[PDB]
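re: ur msg from earlier - yeah i can do the (11S,12R)-Mefloquine complex, just paste it... oh wait u already did. ok heres what im feeding in:
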Amino acid sequence: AIAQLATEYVFSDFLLKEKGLRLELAVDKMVTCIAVGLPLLLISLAFAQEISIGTQISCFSPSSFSWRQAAFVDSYCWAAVQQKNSLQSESGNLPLWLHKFFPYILLLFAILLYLPPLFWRFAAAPHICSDLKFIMEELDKVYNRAIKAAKKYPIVEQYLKTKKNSNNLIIKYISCRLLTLIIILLACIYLGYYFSLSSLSDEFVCSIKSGILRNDSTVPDQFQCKLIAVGIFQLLSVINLVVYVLLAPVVVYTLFVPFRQKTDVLKVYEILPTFDVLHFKSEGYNDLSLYNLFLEENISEVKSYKCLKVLENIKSSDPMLLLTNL
Amino acid sequence: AIAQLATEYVFSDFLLKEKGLRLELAVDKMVTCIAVGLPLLLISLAFAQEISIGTQISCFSPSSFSWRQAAFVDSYCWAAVQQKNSLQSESGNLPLWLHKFFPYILLLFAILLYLPPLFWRFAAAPHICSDLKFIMEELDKVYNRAIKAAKKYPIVEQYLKTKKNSNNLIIKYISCRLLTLIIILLACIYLGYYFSLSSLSDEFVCSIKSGILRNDSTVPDQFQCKLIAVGIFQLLSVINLVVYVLLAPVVVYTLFVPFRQKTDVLKVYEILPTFDVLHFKSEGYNDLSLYNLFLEENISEVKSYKCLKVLENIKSSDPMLLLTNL
Amino acid sequence: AIAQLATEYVFSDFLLKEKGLRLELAVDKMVTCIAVGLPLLLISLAFAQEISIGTQISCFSPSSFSWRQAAFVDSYCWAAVQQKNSLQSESGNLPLWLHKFFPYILLLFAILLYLPPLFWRFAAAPHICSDLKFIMEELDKVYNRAIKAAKKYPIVEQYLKTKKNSNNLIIKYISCRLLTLIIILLACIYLGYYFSLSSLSDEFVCSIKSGILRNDSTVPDQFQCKLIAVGIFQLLSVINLVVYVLLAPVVVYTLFVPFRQKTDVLKVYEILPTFDVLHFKSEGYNDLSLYNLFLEENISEVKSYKCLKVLENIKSSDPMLLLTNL
Amino acid sequence: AIAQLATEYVFSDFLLKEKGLRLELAVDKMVTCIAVGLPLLLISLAFAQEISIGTQISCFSPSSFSWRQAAFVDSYCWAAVQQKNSLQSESGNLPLWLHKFFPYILLLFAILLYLPPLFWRFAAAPHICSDLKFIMEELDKVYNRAIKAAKKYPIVEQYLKTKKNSNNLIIKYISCRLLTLIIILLACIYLGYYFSLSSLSDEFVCSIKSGILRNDSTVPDQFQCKLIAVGIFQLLSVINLVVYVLLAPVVVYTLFVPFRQKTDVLKVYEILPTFDVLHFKSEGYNDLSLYNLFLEENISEVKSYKCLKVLENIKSSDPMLLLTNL
Amino acid sequence: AIAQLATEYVFSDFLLKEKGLRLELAVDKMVTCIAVGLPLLLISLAFAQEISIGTQISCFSPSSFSWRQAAFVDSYCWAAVQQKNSLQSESGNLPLWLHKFFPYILLLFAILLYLPPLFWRFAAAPHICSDLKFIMEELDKVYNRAIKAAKKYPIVEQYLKTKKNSNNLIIKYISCRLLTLIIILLACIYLGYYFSLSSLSDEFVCSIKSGILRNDSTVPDQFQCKLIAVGIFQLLSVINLVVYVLLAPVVVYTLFVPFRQKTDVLKVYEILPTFDVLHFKSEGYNDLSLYNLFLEENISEVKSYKCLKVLENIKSSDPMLLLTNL
Ligand SMILES: O[C@@H](c1cc(C(F)(F)F)nc2c(C(F)(F)F)cccc12)[C@H]1CCCCN1
Ligand SMILES: O[C@@H](c1cc(C(F)(F)F)nc2c(C(F)(F)F)cccc12)[C@H]1CCCCN1
Ligand SMILES: O[C@@H](c1cc(C(F)(F)F)nc2c(C(F)(F)F)cccc12)[C@H]1CCCCN1
Ligand SMILES: O[C@@H](c1cc(C(F)(F)F)nc2c(C(F)(F)F)cccc12)[C@H]1CCCCN1
Ligand SMILES: O[C@@H](c1cc(C(F)(F)F)nc2c(C(F)(F)F)cccc12)[C@H]1CCCCN1
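and the outut:
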């Protein structure tokens, strides 16, 4: 059912569950889930039980034709939207090709939108995963040492600086998001072209006259056929186009990594006396700018950051309290 | 539904899940999943609920024929694409054979593409599994001994050298990938031949005249039949051919084992004082070249390598810090 | 769907999962899975949704006959391939019997191929299971004692010798594999005979004239019927015959137990000083020859064998290292 | 599908899984699973998707009759195999009754074959369960005491003797197996009678003339009907009869409890010095003869029996080794 | 399928699983499962895929009537077995009412048979549950104290006596079993009356003449209708009646609580020296008579009772052995 479909896609997890670590920050998962599942959701809505009257093409055989003769006419003209010579139409052969393969094309866009998140989930996900969990563990060790002192060389600061120098991972990230934006724009171009079709493009005339039926006495020369659900495809197309047009500015915002403005989440550790590491922050296209965003995603999960952020918040309203907080 | 099919194949795990150890390195799993599942995905897309109008062959019986007489004509000509004498066609009997058994042939290619990964998952997978987990355990023991020293005979170096001498496992690996490449090229040849068919090959004429109906007064001599979804098969064929043509250079890259260039992942252990083992690396077709790749897959999972790689990265930006890192 | 069927049989576990111990060595599981599941897979492929046009037999009733009268003709002639007198055919009654009961016969061969692995999984599996896990535990105890010595009577050697004397279990194993080979050859004989049928054997004429219709004025004397999917059965038959013809040499290789040549897997324990047991190996048809093969299957899982095999491999490139390896 | 059915019954567990203890010894589970599931398997094979052409009875209404009039004729004669007066047939009313209720009768035999294993699984299963696990625990305690001595009153011997005196449980067991054998013989009698039917018993003539249609001008006096799949029922009947005829000697062998000849499995404990209990064995119809068989099923699972049997086997090739074995 | 139905009801658990404690003793679960599930099993067998020819009522419209006109006739007469005036029949309106609502009536009997076990599983199950597990725990404590003594006031004896005085729980139990017996007898009365119907009760004549069709020129006055599967209902009715007639003596045996004769299961604890409690047993309708039966169900699960019963059994073939048994 359509409601079972809605629970399957919109209200279920879908590509959201896949625990301690989150290697796909906010917006990414949101953008990927909407962009991938909305062609799937709208295809499945296109052919729901309630909305599909029946056979997609009907062709108006004469009354003299039998049941299976009309079945031949319908099935032949369904197959004969493909070849050029068999049919004539005012719009042309290309919009009928789009009408037949609308769900194929939208599923192709869904898979194409799934490709850059997948290439992220293999090529760059283990590196960000291992590096971020190591940084979380090291920061927990630093706070444990500070708490022990309250009751030599900071590895985290220099390991943060050497990734400030590197920019391979951000190049992978911006390549993923740029491919996603390009595919969204191409899907917008297709959906705008498809919805802008006259809606008489589904109307066409086909002749069942190839082969021996070219020189048969009693067959109609041509058969009026309509591709049913083309209007449903156009309605779902404008819906998909509207949602993708809303989604594309979010992706363009996602491209600008340094503008995202993490609100001094790493600066909270600078307040502690022992933790002299991680004072600075990125101001450009580097790996560290992306590490700051994945940190700002995953740092609330850290044991110590929440306590030290509470210590910072009460200041926002002497470090004796920190010893007391433990 | 087509969307349920897409979630079943593209977005689900498929042949990806099957934890601590990964005995199928990157690209392999990617190439195997795409090459195996894309014939499955495109077959299931070929006969989706929306795209299938109904019966695959219709044959245009006369109006005088009843419903089940036309059913006989359709079913007989479906069966009679097989035998040579029963039908005549401009293209021939072979393309009609391909049209009837297109999903059989693509599933045969999917299983044939699944064979070399399966022969890897039995013949060579236990050996690489046991050897790699032993190497991981030994390297963890070496780092534990080094950390204990900081706070005689390295088995790993000589056990690495004796596999430098051996080349049975790489012969198995290159045999698997060569069989995969050969099957991909054969599938490309078939899909190029199938898509290059004129698309009037589906059109054919069959006579329901074998047996007693040879000398019956009132039956048509021949019946115009079209194999519906042959154009859908050709569209999915060019899609499969395009994806496999993209996939084949990746397999050819996968053949060249020593060119893969692990970026001194084993050299990180040379920096430690106690770990004097594993200084060198392969420069040819040996088992060690494949062990380096499986190592570079699985070494990020190792406890010690990540810490010692952080120690190497800060140098990239005295070993006192290592004692401090613990 | 056919792709769901393929994931159910070829790509899923099937008779592969059913952990620490493997009481069905390599090839056995491979041969059993292919031989059992390929009739199942090809039957399910025979009647897939895409390939089945509809009713399996159609019979060309006259136009005067109604819908349910033609349904009677089809259903009667389906039932009347059984009895001899009701029909006449050029090939005979036996090939039509095979055409009706092709999936029954191939499923019978699948179950018959499943019988010897099942009789192995009950009659001989507990004995090999208990004996092999006891041998693994005893060898682990021997290596633990050797490691303790490095830092009286070997039970394993004499318990190995007394099974060298016995040959009941190998008789059970060779009986299982001989029954499997005989059933494979019988299936090859059937599939070769079935594929060699002319493919006009499906064509036959039946008379709906038994009982009161013997002396009815207006019924045709005989009705041209074709058994649809017989050509599909013949194509799947030659596929099954080709795969079984490939499989039979593997079973014949599996019969020769002593020729299998375990590569001194038990000899690795002879290198240790304390482990003076298990020096020799079989050179004939005994239980010990089969125990060597199940050992060579399961010995990589053993804790100590991998370490001592690494010690042997570095030698292949004084036992001081063993004390160091621990 | 038929292959899904085969995986559901033959290749799945079925009545095999239902861990440490096995209260249904070998052959019993085998005989119960085959005898119960083979009527189920052959019924489900009788009405598979491929083998069922459609409606089971067709009756050849005149061409003047409409679609639903022929539907009435088919449905009425299906119902009117029951009453005697409505139909006439050469064979009689009883074989048509068997043809209509063949799957009911075979399922009745399946449930009747399931009754004695069920009455075993309630009436006698807890007693054999508790007694056998107590005997296993006591024998483990005896070997633990013997191992402690190596490094007064044996309860097991007298508790074994008092069950030598009793014979209630063996009476229950032989009653179960005798009921199973009697039901197998009755099923063999039915299947032999059913297969021996002429196969024109399915042919019969029925009159739709009860009630107001007795005195209606235009209806045929009688309608030629065939019960389709009766030949399929006869083929499956001879298959079931052959398998049950093979199964019945196994049940007759299962009746003779003392002849089963446990190979001195309890005598292995006599070799130990401390374990002076359980020297003798049954030579008649007693509870102890059945306890020996359930012991010989479950004693390989025991920790100590395997070690002491290894000690016995090396002798088969001074008890110093036992102290060493531990 | 019918075989899937059989695995769902007969061979699966059904109302058998619902672990340490069993608050529904033997026979109860057996009687409840058979009595509840056999109407369910026979209803599901009544409308299996193989046995149902199609529409349950067919009515023999004239040939002039169209397809949907005959559909109206069938559907109207199905609805018009309800009202008295619309139809006339030799048997009457009541047996046609039973024929239409046979599965409703048998499901009503199944639910009515499920009511007394359900009222047991709420009203009396917690009390017997808590009391029996407390008695098991107290007896285990008594044996632990006796074993400690071997190496003041018995609460169990007086707590057993005060429930000897009470009879509320046995009144609930006998009310449950009496309601079950009464419902079984009522179902037997119904099934005997239903099977004793002439089997021409399914034959009836209905007039589609209410409303505007009372004064329409061309409709038949009355239509011969048969309710198909009424004979199947009668066969399943005699099967259900036979099984319930067998079941009713078991329920009548279950009513006599004190006659059930627990074989001195509580007397085994009297043999121990410390356990001076629970010497006597019931000889009438009391709560203690039911507690003895639930004890004899659940006492084999007790740790100590099995050991002390082994001590009693060897006597059946000085208490020094008990100290030795521990
Ligand atoms: O909730 C899921 C969802 C799916 C889809 C669609 F269609 F992609 F599957 N569409 C949605 C729409 C929309 F407006 F687009 F319809 C609005 C809101 C949520 C939608 C998503 C969103 C991100 C987090 C959870 N998975
Ligand atoms: O995601 C799965 C996938 C399957 C398939 C197909 F069809 F093989 F099943 N096709 C895919 C395409 C394609 F472009 F080919 F359509 C593009 C991207 C992913 C595809 C794969 C890939 C590897 C890791 C996870 N399993
Ligand atoms: O992978 C499974 C498989 C099944 C089948 C079939 F058909 F038996 F089910 N056929 C297969 C073919 C074949 F060429 F025969 F088609 C080729 C490769 C694998 C096949 C098997 C094999 C052994 C280990 C895992 N189970
Ligand atoms: O494997 C299962 C099986 C079921 C059936 C049937 F039909 F009873 F379900 N038939 C079988 C046949 C037969 F020859 F009879 F077909 C041969 C071999 C195994 C069969 C059984 C057997 C006992 C252990 C596992 N459950
Ligand atoms: O096994 C289950 C079963 C159900 C049914 C029915 F029909 F109630 F569901 N009928 C049965 C018949 C009968 F003869 F009655 F058919 C005979 C034997 C067992 C039957 C029951 C029995 C009690 C323990 C397990 N649940």
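cool cool. Chain E touches chain D through 57 residues (CB under 8 Å). ping me if u need the other ligands too
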